[PDB]
Amino acid sequence: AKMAFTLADRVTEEMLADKAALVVEVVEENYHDAPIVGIAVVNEHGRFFLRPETALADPQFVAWLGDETKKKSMFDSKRAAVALKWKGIELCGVSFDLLLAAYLLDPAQGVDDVAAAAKMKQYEAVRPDEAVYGKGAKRAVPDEPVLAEHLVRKAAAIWELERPFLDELRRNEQDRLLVELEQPLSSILAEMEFAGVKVDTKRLEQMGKELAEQLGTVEQRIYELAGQEFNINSPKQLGVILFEKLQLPVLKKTKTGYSTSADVLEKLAPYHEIVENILHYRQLGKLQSTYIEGLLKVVRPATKKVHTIFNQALTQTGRLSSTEPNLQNIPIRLEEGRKIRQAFVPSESDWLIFAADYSQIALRVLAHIAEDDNLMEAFRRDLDIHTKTAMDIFQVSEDEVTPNMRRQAKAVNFGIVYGISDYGLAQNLNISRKEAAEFIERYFESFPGVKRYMENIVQEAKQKGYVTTLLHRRRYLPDITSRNFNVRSFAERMAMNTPIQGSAADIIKKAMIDLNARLKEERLQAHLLLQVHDELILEAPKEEMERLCRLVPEVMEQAVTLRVPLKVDYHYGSTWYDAK
DNA sequence: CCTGACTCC
DNA sequence: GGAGTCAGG
Numbered sequence: 001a002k003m004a005f006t007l008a009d010r011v012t013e014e015m016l017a018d019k020a021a022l023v024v025e026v027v028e029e030n031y032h033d034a035p036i037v038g039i040a041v042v043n044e045h046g047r048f049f050l051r052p053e054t055a056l057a058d059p060q061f062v063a064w065l066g067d068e069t070k071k072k073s074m075f076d077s078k079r080a081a082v083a084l085k086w087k088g089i090e091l092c093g094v095s096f097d098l099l100l101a102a103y104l105l106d107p108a109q110g111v112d113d114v115a116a117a118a119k120m121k122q123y124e125a126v127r128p129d130e131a132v133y134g135k136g137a138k139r140a141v142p143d144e145p146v147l148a149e150h151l152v153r154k155a156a157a158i159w160e161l162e163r164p165f166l167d168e169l170r171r172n173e174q175d176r177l178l179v180e181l182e183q184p185l186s187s188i189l190a191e192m193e194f195a196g197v198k199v200d201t202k203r204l205e206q207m208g209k210e211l212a213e214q215l216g217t218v219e220q221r222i223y224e225l226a227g228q229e230f231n232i233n234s235p236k237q238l239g240v241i242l243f244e245k246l247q248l249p250v251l252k253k254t255k256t257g258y259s260t261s262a263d264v265l266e267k268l269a270p271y272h273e274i275v276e277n278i279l280h281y282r283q284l285g286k287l288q289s290t291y292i293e294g295l296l297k298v299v300r301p302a303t304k305k306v307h308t309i310f311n312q313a314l315t316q317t318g319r320l321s322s323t324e325p326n327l328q329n330i331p332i333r334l335e336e337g338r339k340i341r342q343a344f345v346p347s348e349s350d351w352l353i354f355a356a357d358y359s360q361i362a363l364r365v366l367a368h369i370a371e372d373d374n375l376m377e378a379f380r381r382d383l384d385i386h387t388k389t390a391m392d393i394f395q396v397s398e399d400e401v402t403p404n405m406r407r408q409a410k411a412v413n414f415g416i417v418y419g420i421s422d423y424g425l426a427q428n429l430n431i432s433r434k435e436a437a438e439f440i441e442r443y444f445e446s447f448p449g450v451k452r453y454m455e456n457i458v459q460e461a462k463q464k465g466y467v468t469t470l471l472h473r474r475r476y477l478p479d480i481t482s483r484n485f486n487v488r489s490f491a492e493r494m495a496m497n498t499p500i501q502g503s504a505a506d507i508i509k510k511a512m513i514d515l516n517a518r519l520k521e522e523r524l525q526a527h528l529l530l531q532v533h534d535e536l537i538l539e540a541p542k543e544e545m546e547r548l549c550r551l552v553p554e555v556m557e558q559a560v561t562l563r564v565p566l567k568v569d570y571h572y573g574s575t576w577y578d579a580k
Numbered sequence: 581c582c583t584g585a586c587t588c589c
Numbered sequence: 590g591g592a593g594t595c596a597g598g
C-alpha cells in the first residue's frame with residue numbers, strides 16, 4: 001500500500017522541474033511566523049520529501065520557489081506563502097490552488113484539507129490532516145517517516161486532482177473565476193496579512209484601565225440592586241436574579257432557559273433599575289473582554305502589529321472572514337465602542353489611514369440583476385434609498401417621511417440585503433410577523449421587478465439545483481425542495497440573497513486586484529491593510545492622500561459596469577477612528 | 581465542544 | 590442572515 005518517494009538529504013535538479021505539486025507544511029493554525037515542518041515535491045521525475053532546514057537554505061531551491069515560470073500546484077498556497085514571507089522567501093508561480101478550486105465548486109462541502117478535496121473525486125489515498133496531527137491538546141507533529149509519507153501523499157493527490165478539478169470548473173464556467181480572481185486575490189491577501197496593522201497598545205491599555213474602573217462601579221451597583229452577589233456573565237444566575245428573585249416578566253425563552261438578550265432587557269428596564277445597569281455592564285464588558293484584552297493578546301510584541309488571517313475558502317456567499325484577530329467586527333455604530341478604532345494606527349511615521357466604502361452595493365447589485373425600473377432610477381438619481389423606500393411603501397412625499405417611517409423602510413432594506421425571514425424582520429422591528437409580511441408586500445408593489453427576480457431565482461434554483469453570482473460563484477440549494485416549510489423557506493431566501501451578497505463579494509474582490517495593479521503602476525507606497533466586506537482600508541504616506549482620494553474610489557467604482565452606477569465614499573486620518 | 585450573546589457587513 | 594470571539598457550563 002505504501003507510496004514510494006525519495007527521502008532526500010539534499011536538493012537535486014530533478015526536484016526543480018517547471019511543473020510540480022508542492023507541499024510546504026505549516027501545522028500551526030496561525031501560520032504567522034510559524035514553523036515549516038516539511039516539504040514535498042511531486043513532479044514528472046518522482047516524489048520527494050525535503051527537510052526545510054535543508055531546502056530553505058539551498059539557493060537553487062529558493063530560486064525555484066521564487067521563479068514565476070516554475071509552475072506549482074498546491075493546497076492553501078496563502079499559508080505557505082505567508083510562512084515563507086516571514087523567513088524572507090518569495091513563493092511565485094502557483095498556478096493552481098486545490099483549496100480555492102474546491103471552494104468554488106461547492107463551498108458547502110467544507111473542504112479544509114487535501115483529503116476532503118480528494119474525496120470529491122473518489123480519491124482516498126491520502127489521510128485527513130486531523131488523523132495525522134491529532135486534535136486539540138493531543139495535537140503534535142509525528143515522526144519523520146509518518147510525516148514524510150503524509151506530505152508526499154498530499155502532493156501526489158494534488159498532482160492527480162488538478163486536471164479533474166480544472167475540468168469541472170471549465171464545465172461550470174468558473175475557471176476564470178479561479179485563475180483570474182481567487183488565485184490572484186490570494187496573493188494580495190497574503191501581502192495584507194503579512195503587512196499587518198499597527199496597534200497603539202498604550203492607548204488600548206489606558207482604555208482598559210478606565211473600563212476596569214467603570215465596570216467595578218456598575219458591578220457593585222448591580223449587586224446592591226440585586227441584594228446579592230452573583231455572576232452577571234452567567235445566563236443562568238442572571239436569569240434567576242431577573243425572573244425568579246425580581247420577578248420580571250418572561251417575554252422570551254431560549255431552548256435552555258430565559259432569554260436575556262439586549263432586546264429583551266430593553267423592554268424590561270421600566271420595571272427595575274437593575275436592568276439598565278446590566279445592559280451597561282454588558283456593553284462595557286464586551287469592550288473589555290473582546291476588544292481590549294482580546295486584541296492585546298494577539299498583538300505581536302516585536303512590532304506591536306496584529307496580523308489577521310483572512311479565510312478565503314469558508315463562507316457560503318463568497319465573503320472573506322477574518323481571524324486572530326477578527327478585524328471585520330471592530331465597533332463603529334456606538335461612540336463608546338467606536339473609540340477602539342483610535343488604537344489602529346499607521347505603521348510608519350507621517351503615514352495615514354485611508355478608508356473607502358461602497359454606498360449600498362448590495363441594493364445596487366439587486367437593481368442591476370432584477371432590472372427593477374424604480375430601483376434603478378433611485379440609484380441613477382443617487383437618492384437616499386431608505387427615504388425613497390419609505391416614500392414608496394407609505395405612498396408619501398419626501399417631506400412627509402418621518403424618522404420612524406425611514407427606520408421601518410431601512411429595516412426592510414436590511415432584510416433584503418441579508419435575506420432574513422419575515423420572523424427576523426418582525427423581531428428587528430418589534431412588530432408582528434403579520435405586519436412584517438405586510439411591509440414586504442408593499443415593497444413588492446413598489447418594486448415589481450425585485451418581486452419578479454425573487455420569484456424567478458427561486459424557480460431557477462429549483463430547476464438547476466444552485467444559484468450563481470455575476471462572476472459565476474455557485475451555491476447549491478438542495479433544501480429548496482424540502483417538505484418542511486421553514487427549511488424550504490430558508491433555502492428560498494438563500495436563492496434570493498446569494499446572487500446579491502455574492503455578486504457584491506465578487507465586485508470588491510475584483511476591485512482589490514485592480515487596485516493593487518494600479519497602485520504599483522502609479523508607483524505609490526500606499527498598500528491595502530484590510531477588507532471589511534464592502535470597504536477597503538489602506539495606509540499610505542500623508543503625501544499620497546490627495547492622489548488616493550481620486551484613484552481609490554475610481555478603481556472601486558469601475559471594477560464592474562452595471563445598469564446603475566457604483567458609488568464609493570472615502571475618508572482618511574491619523575487613526576482608523578479618524579478615517580471618518 | 582455547545583449555547584447564548586453581541587459585534588461587523 | 591452569517592461570520593468570529595468571549596464566557597459559562
Ligand SMILES: Nc1ccn([C@H]2C[C@H](O)[C@@H](COP(=O)(O)OP(=O)(O)OP(=O)(O)O)O2)c(=O)n1
Pocket residue numbers: 170173174175176177178470471472
Ligand atoms: N470559462 C469561464 C467563463 C466565465 N467565468 C466567469 C467570469 C466571467 O467574468 C463571468 C462572466 O462570464 P461571461 O462574460 O462570459 O458571460 P457569459 O457569456 O458566461 O454569460 P453570463 O455572464 O450571463 O453567465 O463568469 C468564468 O469564471 N469562467
